[PDB]
Design an enzyme around this catalytic site. Structure first.
Site, mmCIF file in Angstrom:
data_model
loop_
_atom_site.group_PDB
_atom_site.id
_atom_site.type_symbol
_atom_site.label_atom_id
_atom_site.label_comp_id
_atom_site.label_asym_id
_atom_site.label_seq_id
_atom_site.Cartn_x
_atom_site.Cartn_y
_atom_site.Cartn_z
ATOM 1 N N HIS A 6 46.684 35.957 37.512
ATOM 2 C CA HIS A 6 46.316 37.127 36.734
ATOM 3 C C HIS A 6 47.575 37.651 36.089
ATOM 4 O O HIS A 6 48.669 37.136 36.352
ATOM 5 C CB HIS A 6 45.685 38.212 37.611
ATOM 6 C CG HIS A 6 46.618 38.718 38.660
ATOM 7 N ND1 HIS A 6 46.696 38.157 39.921
ATOM 8 C CD2 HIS A 6 47.535 39.709 38.633
ATOM 9 C CE1 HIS A 6 47.616 38.793 40.622
ATOM 10 N NE2 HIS A 6 48.144 39.738 39.863
ATOM 11 N N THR A 21 48.929 45.693 44.221
ATOM 12 C CA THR A 21 47.735 46.535 44.100
ATOM 13 C C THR A 21 47.233 46.801 45.501
ATOM 14 O O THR A 21 47.539 46.028 46.407
ATOM 15 C CB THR A 21 46.588 45.853 43.337
ATOM 16 O OG1 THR A 21 46.157 44.708 44.085
ATOM 17 C CG2 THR A 21 47.000 45.442 41.927
ATOM 18 N N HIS A 37 40.767 45.897 36.722
ATOM 19 C CA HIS A 37 42.187 46.270 36.688
ATOM 20 C C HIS A 37 43.043 45.286 35.923
ATOM 21 O O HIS A 37 44.076 45.648 35.342
ATOM 22 C CB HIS A 37 42.773 46.371 38.088
ATOM 23 C CG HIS A 37 42.097 47.367 38.970
ATOM 24 N ND1 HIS A 37 41.209 47.003 39.953
ATOM 25 C CD2 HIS A 37 42.176 48.719 39.009
ATOM 26 C CE1 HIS A 37 40.791 48.082 40.582
ATOM 27 N NE2 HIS A 37 41.352 49.142 40.023
ATOM 28 N N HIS A 85 49.793 41.324 34.452
ATOM 29 C CA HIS A 85 49.989 42.746 34.238
ATOM 30 C C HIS A 85 50.681 42.894 32.899
ATOM 31 O O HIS A 85 51.553 42.083 32.588
ATOM 32 C CB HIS A 85 50.845 43.360 35.344
ATOM 33 C CG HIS A 85 50.338 43.067 36.722
ATOM 34 N ND1 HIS A 85 49.530 43.947 37.412
ATOM 35 C CD2 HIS A 85 50.492 41.985 37.519
ATOM 36 C CE1 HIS A 85 49.231 43.425 38.593
ATOM 37 N NE2 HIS A 85 49.792 42.229 38.676
ATOM 38 N N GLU A 129 55.957 44.144 36.282
ATOM 39 C CA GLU A 129 56.057 44.883 37.529
ATOM 40 C C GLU A 129 57.476 44.766 38.076
ATOM 41 O O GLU A 129 58.150 45.776 38.276
ATOM 42 C CB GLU A 129 55.025 44.364 38.521
ATOM 43 C CG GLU A 129 53.607 44.542 37.979
ATOM 44 C CD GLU A 129 52.565 44.608 39.057
ATOM 45 O OE1 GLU A 129 52.461 43.661 39.862
ATOM 46 O OE2 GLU A 129 51.834 45.614 39.087
HETATM 47 N N1 LIG Z 1 49.728 41.655 42.182
HETATM 48 S S1 LIG Z 1 49.674 40.569 43.268
HETATM 49 O O1 LIG Z 1 50.286 41.231 44.304
HETATM 50 O O2 LIG Z 1 50.203 39.311 42.905
HETATM 51 O O3 LIG Z 1 48.191 40.285 43.615
HETATM 52 C C1 LIG Z 1 47.128 41.296 43.744
HETATM 53 C C2 LIG Z 1 46.225 40.904 44.513
HETATM 54 C C3 LIG Z 1 45.167 40.310 43.610
HETATM 55 N N2 LIG Z 1 45.338 40.921 42.305
HETATM 56 S S2 LIG Z 1 44.275 41.195 41.440
HETATM 57 O O4 LIG Z 1 43.310 40.189 41.637
HETATM 58 O O5 LIG Z 1 44.695 41.482 40.180
HETATM 59 C C4 LIG Z 1 43.678 42.792 42.065
HETATM 60 O O6 LIG Z 1 43.281 42.512 43.366
HETATM 61 C C5 LIG Z 1 42.253 43.251 44.022
HETATM 62 C C6 LIG Z 1 42.521 43.707 45.416
HETATM 63 O O7 LIG Z 1 43.658 43.240 46.100
HETATM 64 C C7 LIG Z 1 41.294 44.115 43.218
HETATM 65 O O8 LIG Z 1 40.912 45.329 43.893
HETATM 66 C C8 LIG Z 1 41.652 44.438 41.875
HETATM 67 O O9 LIG Z 1 40.501 44.720 41.064
HETATM 68 C C9 LIG Z 1 42.748 43.674 41.226
HETATM 69 O O10 LIG Z 1 42.607 43.344 39.881
HETATM 70 C C10 LIG Z 1 46.319 41.640 42.387
HETATM 71 ZN ZN LIG Z 2 49.782 40.848 40.185
#
Ligand SMILES: NS(=O)(=O)O[C@@H]1CCN(S(=O)(=O)[C@@H]2O[C@@H](CO)[C@@H](O)[C@H](O)[C@@H]2O)C1
Ligand SMILES: [Zn+2]
Length: 260
Positions: A94, A199, A64, A96, A106
């Site tokens: 990570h 997510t 993702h 977006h 976001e």
């Molecule tokens: N956006 S955020 O709220 O700061 O953090 C969320 C929580 C962790 N990520 S993540 O590592 O990109 C994401 O998390 C996973 C599950 O929670 C995976 O199922 C998935 O493949 C994914 O890429 C997003």
């Molecule tokens: Zn995130």
């Protein structure tokens, strides 16, 4: 929603509630940050970002997004202060991003979308591990940073130069000795509000800290983001772009600003 959840027509954000009903909950993220409804809170302490001893481990395409993971078995890279009580350990960061420069973030600011958004994910050490932390209303703190397209960010280049080695879902690589301090803007002025993971599982466990100042990255840097794949190796190629959840209802929440 068919489903390993995702961002496509048949499996995207509008579908998530069927497997994760908290998607329609009372403190979901991201949100639009209305800058003249946010209230300056002079009782908010300065943010403390202590990343000097950070130990990065791996970089991973998770299907993702891509993430860089850190050793969180000690207080090496921690977030304190601001709206937070206690100590939050950095686990991973990570991004977006969008298919074009006018979308990808976001959070939005007065409905403005940025080209991308960086999330540094931290968990509250009083809960012992991140799995326990995600079950608590104050379990996580995510530091959100906007990216606009302009001049290159030198501190990002080590990241984009290894992306060709993790093109498809599941691929990972060694990514040691990366300093996440190179991804921060000058100012630590921020907005903060109680929210959720953006997510699945969309758990309502996050204190969001969103920095006012975007960092600038170059068009060549973001173009490398857009060469990644949602798919695994050998599957029909679907570029990893537009992996952002849109803004959710603010409901009964106030966004506070650390700055006047
Ligand atoms: N956006 S955020 O709220 O700061 O953090 C969320 C929580 C962790 N990520 S993540 O590592 O990109 C994401 O998390 C996973 C599950 O929670 C995976 O199922 C998935 O493949 C994914 O890429 C997003
Ligand atoms: Zn995130």
């Amino acid at each position: 929603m068919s489903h390993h959840w995702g961002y496509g027509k048949h499996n995207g954000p509008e579908h998530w509630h069927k497997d994760f009903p908290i998607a329609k909950g009372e403190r979901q993220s991201p949100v639009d940050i209305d800058t003249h409804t946010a209230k300056y809170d002079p009782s908010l302490k300065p943010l403390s970002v202590s990343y000097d001893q950070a130990t990065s481990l791996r970089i991973l395409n998770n299907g993702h997004s891509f993430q860089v993971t850190f050793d969180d078995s000690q207080d090496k890279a921690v977030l304190k202060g601001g709206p937070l009580d206690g100590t939050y350990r950095l686990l991973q960061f990570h991004f977006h991003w969008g298919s074009l420069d006018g979308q990808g973030s976001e959070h939005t600011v007065d409905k403005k979308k940025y080209a991308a958004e960086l999330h540094l994910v931290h968990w509250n050490t009083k809960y012992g591990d991140v799995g326990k932390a995600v079950q608590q209303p104050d379990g996580l703190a995510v530091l959100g940073i906007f990216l606009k397209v302009g001049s290159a960010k030198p501190g990002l280049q080590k990241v984009v130069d290894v992306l060709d080695s993790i093109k498809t879902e599941g691929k990972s690589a060694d990514f040691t000795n990366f300093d996440p301090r190179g991804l921060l803007p000058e100012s630590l002025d921020y907005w903060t509000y109680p929210g959720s993971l953006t997510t699945p599982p969309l758990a309502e466990c996050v204190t969001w800290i969103v920095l006012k100042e975007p960092i600038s990255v170059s068009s060549e840097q973001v173009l490398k983001f857009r060469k990644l794949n949602f798919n695994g190796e050998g599957e029909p190629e679907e570029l990893m772009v537009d992996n952002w959840r849109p803004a959710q209802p603010l409901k009964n929440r106030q966004i506070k600003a650390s700055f006047k």
